Amino acid sequence: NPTRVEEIICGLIKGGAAKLQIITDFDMTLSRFSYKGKRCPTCHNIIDNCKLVTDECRRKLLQLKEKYYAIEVDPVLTVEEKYPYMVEWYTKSHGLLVQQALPKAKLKEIVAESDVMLKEGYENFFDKLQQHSIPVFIFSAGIGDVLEEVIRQAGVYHPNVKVVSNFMDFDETGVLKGFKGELIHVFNKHDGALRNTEYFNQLKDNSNIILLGDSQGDLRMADGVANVEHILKIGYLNDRVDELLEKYMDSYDIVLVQDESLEVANSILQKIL
Ligand SMILES: [Mg+2]
């Protein structure tokens, strides 16, 4: 509904900066799906495709990423069933990264030399929010260390930006030994939201929320919010469009089909801040 949408936004404008927080995922939501007719990497793709991984390992990774993607997007498997294979996927991929023994100290370059790209209008996005100290919660199934390097180098890792994702654990050689915490993956963001109660309880007054996502999973990122009064959900539908469009229309407040900018969120922010 166009009217239900403006009712929500008017709630937002009314509350201003004092009541606003942002929740958002990273991959394909702050970062582009494609650019100049070529696909852009996900955090995981950044690592797969870099010079610190052998030809043979990347072949094993693609062999994986083909088998397990096929299962993720299976129309007949219920998500109940997909869950273990998603778990299985990440475990093997990370296992293959681990053996490669990647240096903590070499991330800076790797990100620098990838084709990673942020949606149009990100400076304006991140700079407006910092200027009004609007809490930003970035919740990602990707790789925290790379995510973080993408936004630091883009010059937008502001003090209001809390990043929560799958973070790497290293040994005393500054060389990868695995991953901290319980795994975040596409199907369990709810479980992850509730685990971040400390964060949200400090924002008891920030009761106006804009959620940004690009998957059906992303819809659950708000489940740990203390006070909800008004909430707007923006969905970036980049792929599997004809399959999922009626679904997105039915759950996100705004669907943006293959929209590689942040202009819609910026214009809403324009009206609020
Ligand atoms: Mg995503």
From Swiss-Prot:
Keywords from the named record: Cytoplasm, Disease variant, Endoplasmic reticulum, Hydrolase, Magnesium, Metal-binding, Nucleotide metabolism, Nucleotide-binding, Phosphoprotein, Transferase
Binding site for N(7)-methyl-GMP: E72, S93
Phosphoserine: residues bearing it: S215
Active-site residues, Swiss-Prot/TrEMBL: D25, D27
Documented effect of changing F26A: Almost complete loss of nucleotidase and phosphotransferase activity
EC number: 3.1.3.5, 3.1.3.91
Expression sites by tissue: Isoforms 1, 3 and 4 are expressed in reticulocytes. Isoform 4 is hardly detectable in bone marrow and fetal liver.
Keyword Glycosyltransferase attached: no
Catalytic activity: N(7)-methyl-GMP + H2O = N(7)-methylguanosine + phosphate; CMP + H2O = cytidine + phosphate; a ribonucleoside 5'-phosphate + H2O = a ribonucleoside + phosphate
Record-listed CMP binding positions: E72
Induction comment from the UniProt entry of this chain: Isoform 2 is induced by interferon alpha in Raji cells in association with lupus inclusions.
Positions bound to substrate: S140, A141, K189
Function as written in the Swiss-Prot or TrEMBL entry: Nucleotidase which shows specific activity towards cytidine monophosphate (CMP) and 7-methylguanosine monophosphate (m(7)GMP). CMP seems to be the preferred substrate.
Entry's family note: Belongs to the pyrimidine 5'-nucleotidase family.
The protein's name in its UniProt record: Cytosolic 5'-nucleotidase 3A
Residues of the full protein shown: 64 to 336 of 336
